[PDB]
Amino acid sequence: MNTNNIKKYAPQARNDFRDAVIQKLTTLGIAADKKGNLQIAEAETIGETVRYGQFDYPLSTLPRRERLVKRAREQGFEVLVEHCAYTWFNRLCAIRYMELHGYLDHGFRMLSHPETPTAFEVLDHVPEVAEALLPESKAQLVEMKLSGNQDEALYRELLLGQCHALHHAMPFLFEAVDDEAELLLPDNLTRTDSILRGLVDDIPEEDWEQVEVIGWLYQFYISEKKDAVIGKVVKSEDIPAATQLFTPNWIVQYLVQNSVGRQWLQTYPDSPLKDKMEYYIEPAEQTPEVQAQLAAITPASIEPESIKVLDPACGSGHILTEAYNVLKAIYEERGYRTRDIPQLILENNIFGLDIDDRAAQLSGFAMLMLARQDDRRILGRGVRLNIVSLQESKLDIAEVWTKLNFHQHMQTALANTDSAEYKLLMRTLALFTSAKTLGSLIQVPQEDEAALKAFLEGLYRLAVEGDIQQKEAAAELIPYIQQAWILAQRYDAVVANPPYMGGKGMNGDLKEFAKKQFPDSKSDLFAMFMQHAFSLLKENGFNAQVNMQSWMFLSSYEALRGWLLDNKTFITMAHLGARAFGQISGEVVQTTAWVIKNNHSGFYKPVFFRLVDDNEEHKKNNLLNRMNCFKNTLQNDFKKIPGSPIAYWATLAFINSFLKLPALGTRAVKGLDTNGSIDVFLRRWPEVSINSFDALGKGNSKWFPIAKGGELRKWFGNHEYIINYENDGIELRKNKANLRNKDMYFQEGGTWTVVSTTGFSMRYMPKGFLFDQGGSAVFCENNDELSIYNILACMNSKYINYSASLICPTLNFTTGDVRKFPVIKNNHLEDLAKKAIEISKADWNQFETSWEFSKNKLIEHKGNVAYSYASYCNFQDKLYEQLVNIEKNINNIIEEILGFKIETTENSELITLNSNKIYRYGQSETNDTFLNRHRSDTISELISYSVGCQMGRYSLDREGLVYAHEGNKGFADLVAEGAYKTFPADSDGILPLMDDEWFEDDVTSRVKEFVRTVWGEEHLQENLEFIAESLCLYAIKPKKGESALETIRRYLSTQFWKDHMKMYKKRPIYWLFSSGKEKAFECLVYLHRYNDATLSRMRTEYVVPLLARYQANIDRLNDQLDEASGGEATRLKRERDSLIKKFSELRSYDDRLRHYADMRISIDLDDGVKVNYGKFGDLLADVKAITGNAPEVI
Amino acid sequence: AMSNMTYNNVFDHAYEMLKENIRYDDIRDTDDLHDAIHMAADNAVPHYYADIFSVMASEGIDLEFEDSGLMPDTKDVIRILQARIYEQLTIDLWEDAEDLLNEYLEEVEEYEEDEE
Amino acid sequence: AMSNMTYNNVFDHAYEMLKENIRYDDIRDTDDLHDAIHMAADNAVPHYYADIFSVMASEGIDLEFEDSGLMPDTKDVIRILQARIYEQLTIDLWEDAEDLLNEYLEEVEEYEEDEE
């Protein structure tokens, strides 16, 4: 088999049928506008026939065309077109299935010929099939066949007669004689090449033998419409498309079998049926009291007609078919007549309502064919089916009643108003008003359906015989009466799959309907269906459905879940994941299948089934032999938990631990929200003038630290952003920004990430930091019995992590969540907490990113560089061991206090520390290569600190950054005072990445001087070799025949600017100026030490001398090696060509630099590095990545 | 070699960044996330030479270059490889960005919480 | 995985081709063997995606071009990588060309192997 064949062919069938409908309607004179307006052509009565001016329509059929025009005017062109195309597709598929199985009376193949391709078996036996379906004019058909002209007309008439006979058999799928579709029948179907030919030669006959394939192609017929509808609010006309789904056989079997078998075992268990079906779970026993209660409430016995099945969402009808199978088994147990059993199942206990008309038609066809397979005589009997679709009712009942002449045959002088007959009529009429978009969510009482059954039998008698116009009125009125009766009657079992909506997919009218008629679970539609099914479910009934898993565990629906557990009990659970269920293709949706008992029955123990682990193909035999019974859990156990989520891994010890335990709900609060100026109101910490923000705290004119919440951090870190709040956030107030909890601003406490991706973790939140939305904060109460340290220690416990995972399965958290997690008190937890926070603070201040920067640990120790590296690694591992000991002690003491063992994964065994190698790296490549990467990174950080200290921000003799002002103002005074007395700083502020040691202040020479000064004169050679080896290990590719100084110079030229950019997250402060491919000119300038005259200064002091040197060098090399023919001659010629190119590039860069230099532009730090980088021009390096925009040239 | 990753891991990381940024930046239309997709593609490209070669040799990305503008004008080759990876990442990420922002539309639909 | 050959294998193959060329073409001048070394370097090319990637990931070859003229102007990474490999082979063969010249003229000295 191949469902892909029909999956591809069905949308194409839809397209071709739509094209045929449109072309036939145009040939009928009916046209559509580009605005959707309907155009009607008038056929003048020239003679016996009529004509719209181009097409001579038959006059006798003209009133039918006018009726079709009226239908179009009532509905619309496009809706009528899709209706006709869908109906014709269904009819063609039905006839194809009919002929393939040979159920037809004539026993021939209509759509094709079994032996001859592109031919019809009906053409072989025209006399026989004609005498079979159209007994009149058989001789005429035979002689016309032998007349020798086209017989495709005869084939069309034979098809029409067969369709009429089928309609006489079942009317829902086939139309009566003299219908509108007959005049609209495509002319292509009357041709040698036809859509029927394509569908009979394309789809394999061996694949056609399965009715599941028929349901599959029914679902595939609406695929592109589903593609188009998604992404916007689904229109009411498009709502039935959104209600199109498919379900796997095994889940449907499980639901229906569990419900009917629970009823059966309740009645009497000795019946051998429980051996017959597959998916059923035996209920267990807990106490004799509940068993006695259920034995009291259970019935002694039932009858097959007593049990009834409701299908609020009929769809294709798989659920109803499985119900048919189990009901047939029950009837066989009764021992009734073999051929009467299917008839009895058809007559009753089927019902089933649908939103779309043709879905109901196909479901009825499937039921009729299943009965036909059971018994071949059922087709002749022609028993009406209860599967109908909810049709909109907007007609005047008075006119129909006058046409019905009902007023005088059984009872103008309308007196049935006193008999409530008119009253029930207009009540039902009003109930269904604009109900097509509403669906099956209309509630009706049972007295109404009793009276409606009486009136329905009356209408049946009237339609059987009487006045023809009364017959028409009864036919018009009957669907409303029958649908009202079906929707108002109560049912024993309601098993169906609710439609799957989108967030705001439903119409605004549906939004209002849900808002007014359901105060609970109004955010969705599946809960709507299940609640209404509970309304339609009688006492002690079973409601089995496959809903989403969101409402099993969510902060919303807490009232819904509480009410349903207080008033109902659920017998069986089945929690499927993203792949176990086959209802939706893809992991986006995650569904759960449940069956709930109507009676509350107080507390009862359910059985549970886990399926998230694997997929459907595995989950079938996994469910056959489950391993997740979890019978120990009880209803009272489930209700005793915060928010009442259904927990599969619930421990009574755990839930008992939760109770009688304090849980904060006031100390934690929410932050402030900016109204959309975050790009301008929040910035990175080192971009602003550090002299104004970190220092000069009295002014407060600069920004303030902010918390947002990033990577999971346990104790300290994750704070590198600032926000402007001058004059109590005057700019934010002018921006109309929401400021909540203003009283806790710049206050000491703790902060936890609002929406994390790994788990729950809160870190100490220092005093004086502004607090923002995201990374929400907690604030201990004044004179509170619990210190903040103790609360942090309690929350860091893995028990709290497991509890958080349980209460909110989603990794996202909220204020309501932190209102719920428990907290305890101890007199040693806070000491471990403060030790841990101090350790984490040291670790986070170990690097340059934090403003509490501690000096490089390598230069702090004297000796060999390898000695310093070993000491640094010793410090790292000592920190790690102390941290893990403290964490284990905390977990052990909290476990001892709890008394119930708890287990977590990657919560306690994992710690957050940069010293820990596996945390900062992938952890999957533990081959000791990560140790080498650590070595290379450490050496690179040392080199970066050296180049920073060379250039004026850091002074090795002092502590921390020594210059942080803007505009190169206030630097000479520091020099005179003695800040840089040990190591001088380049006065011009320009670091040239020039050739090998040509300029006075080449970076390589300065770094060599630095490494010499730090570690003496005797070990400098081996230290330089060690640094070069570390660089060549992992940061840069190893090179052959390279000296240490060459290695460090090559690292500085390439893969140093990239590393510096990565370190500061695309916000560089050592800006780079480059010339291009030749790299003739390369310089580095400090952002905070940039002056407007620096451009011209460096243009006149670093470019023209280099240009002169290049010119002298090329002249000398041109003179050198004259008339030489050795290899060195070619080498020198290539070198001189290369530096000729470099000279040309340098000259162009000089021209551009002089053109930009006269402007003497100046930038402001508060603007941000992005806008300044864009403003500088094309002389800057790598602006596309930094500013996310292409460079410009002037 | 010392590195063994495919384009799939880099794409997953970039997709995670895109989700994080559509959450922080509060973008509700389909035109104010071009910066978001740009940064998501930019912060995903590997930096180590062996890593870039490994992802270059893996499936999911194409050796040919779609646009000339993305090509940097340098004598370095690993720069060009990073540019190619960046282009592939941004193309696929912008392809999935519509669905991601549509998902965030559910959250922005309500005024207190998506699920309320 | 799919390819494990490194740069020195290509070096060996190019060296052998240069030996064959100096043996066959009867070259007795550096400028005469310039075309020989050029063609020897030209032939030794991996000519395969995984092969070129593995050769690039190997050691003994610079990751940055020395000449801007060698730039092949095309939107294909494989062409650029092949150009770099060819340039490196050319440089190495030029560095080790005169020894084969000397050997060939010593085995060809006087009449064949030093006869007349």
Swiss-Prot record, chains B, C:
Biological process per Gene Ontology, one example term: symbiont-mediated suppression of host innate immune response
Keyword Cytoplasm: no
One family name in Pfam for this protein: ocr
Keyword ATP-binding tagged: no
InterPro entries hit by this protein: B-form_Ocr, Ocr
Signal peptide range in chain numbering: none
Keywords in alphabetical order: Early protein, Host-virus interaction, Inhibition of host innate immune response by virus, Restriction-modification system evasion by virus, Viral immunoevasion
Function (record text): Prevents both degradation and modification of T7 DNA by the host restriction-modification complex. Structural mimic of the phosphate backbone of B-form DNA that binds to and completely occupies the DNA-binding sites of all known families of the complex type I DNA restriction enzymes. Thereby, inhibits the restriction endonuclease activity and protects the phage genome as it penetrates into host cytoplasm. Inhibits host transcription by binding to the bacterial RNAP and competing with sigma factors. Inhibits the host exclusion defense system BREX.
Subunit structure: Homodimer. Interacts with HsdM (AC P08957), the M subunit of host type I methyltransferase restriction enzyme M.EcoKI; 1 Ocr dimer binds to M.EcoKI. Interacts with HsdR (AC P08956), the R subunit of host type I bifunctional endonuclease and methyltransferase restriction enzyme R.EcoKI; 2 Ocr dimers binds to R.EcoKI. Interacts with host PglX/BrxX (AC P0DUF9); this interaction inhibits the enzymatic activity of PglX/BrxX through high-affinity binding. Forms a 2:2 tetrameric complex with phage T7 OCR.
Protein name, per record: Protein Ocr
